[model samples]
Target: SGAIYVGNYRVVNRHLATHNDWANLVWEDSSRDLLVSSTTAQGCDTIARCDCQTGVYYCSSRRKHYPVSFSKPSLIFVEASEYYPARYQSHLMLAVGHSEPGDCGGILRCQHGVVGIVSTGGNGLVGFADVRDLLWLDEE
Candidate 1:
């Protein structure tokens, strides 16, 4: 049940996708590549998008959104048909590019060749989360 923490934004599995379902959003903290949406099912790709101007995070799949003025928020995702042609089954991950110890003004860094973007705002101090999984590859 590993998780990614970027300021107050946490990318951790709350629990099974649904009650009584064996499928879980297994967080692979070790690899930090992507959260396996389910172990026994499909249609549960973890995805996210952010408003570059507001630093607001959005999970379209879940119809959920949030804002983090504590630090600049970044969104990460991949879209390569060669590796994941299914499109609808692609998973996403988040990582910090740069930040002060307690400041929210940070850049975005994309892992696993995935794309990423950042917003501007926040202050104090912030730090980068471990993203070994985001850089992991099958060849490794």
Candidate 2:
């Protein structure tokens, strides 16, 4: 990742990779009409974008200039498939990539409505369980 100066603020640009395990700062620079996303700033989950038309800044999808904080941001450029030949027979596969210091250390794969999450439990022992209760279906 590289850093660039936008007016008075120094913005860092970073791209997502398979080995990344930290959150990113995503912003849209109206001045240059460009999008900026980075993982350089580790402690911040929100980003502020300057408005060229009004010289105002908006952060975390807000309408003001102050920077906002968040724990979860939207996942972008996801890859999906109708099915995974080795796993679920007829289930859809959704690959959602995430990056967070300790909370997000791996990719979450959802097959139809089944998901398995394993983590350190923030304690000492490793724990994991299957998730299915949160799944919902739309009836047409």
Candidate 3:
């Protein structure tokens, strides 16, 4: 029930992935510590390569994350997992690396777009409403 701002647009949850699923096609190359994908971009921009990564690729620092609260002040580190080893049953995502507090209704950004909505997790994990299964994505 939180509102997020994307560019000049204020966005809210239009749908939820209750009975949805998503399996990442990316593979982690242990030798280089980089993620490899089965596909690549076309006609969008230059730098065409067959292997595309969500994190090491187009995602920029300029994009904004929503619902960040300063009320619970803390300087802990945290991150969302890029790819899950198992098939996701719902929109819930895994967060790891370090524990970050104040992880409420925030969002996860990937490739300069909002992918997952942060669900309540004092445990600094769990995401809700991954938009991959939403039918209303056609308007985007």
Candidate 4:
């Protein structure tokens, strides 16, 4: 469980279409490099969206994801992804992207990508008890 701070970092396992059970949606626009919706399982809960190129994410505790607000939040690369794509399981690691709890305004700024979308708690903060197990997601 790493955090984003500044510049680019090494993302371990943050791929989007690893455990995607929605095979149907993946075909909607197979040509355009679209995001495969990482907000389905836990939303803003324990999961967060990282960049397709630059990995980065924030804390969450909901069932949906919102756009991130670039604003002035610092960015850091995160590293995280399932070791096995077919198994859809990975040891979440650190990466890069935007984040600034002290000034980013709220969870939205930390959610990463999009640029200007807060999470469930919005301008609120998260606690240790809210973190859920990433392994418990997408049981399909």
Q: Which candidate is the best by lDDT?
A: 3
Give all TM-scores, in the order shown: 0.22, 0.17, 0.34, 0.19
Output the worst ten-in-a-row residue range by lDDT, candidate 1: 113-122
- Candidate ranking (TM-score, best to worst): 3, 1, 4, 2
Model 3 CA deviation exceeding 4 Å by range = 4-89, 97-102
Q: For each candidate in the order shown, give its overall lDDT on alpha carbons.
A: 0.28, 0.22, 0.30, 0.24
By TM-score, the better pick of 2 and 4 is 4
Candidate order (lDDT): 3, 1, 4, 2
- Per-residue accuracy of model 1 over 1-140 as CA lDDT, tens digit each: 22333322233332211342224333433212233233332222222233222233332222433343323322423233222322221122233223222222122232222122221111321222222234322111
Candidate 4 TM-score versus the reference: 0.19
Worst lDDT window (10 residues) for model 2? 83-92
| Candidate 2 segments exceeding 4 Å error | 1-114, 122-124, 137-140
lDDT of 2 at 66: 23
CA shift of 43, model 2, Å: 26
The residue-by-residue lDDT of candidate 3 on 1-140, one tens digit each, is: 34333322233333211121113222222211122222222212111112111322111122343332111112233333332222323334444312233333344445444544443233533333343333332222
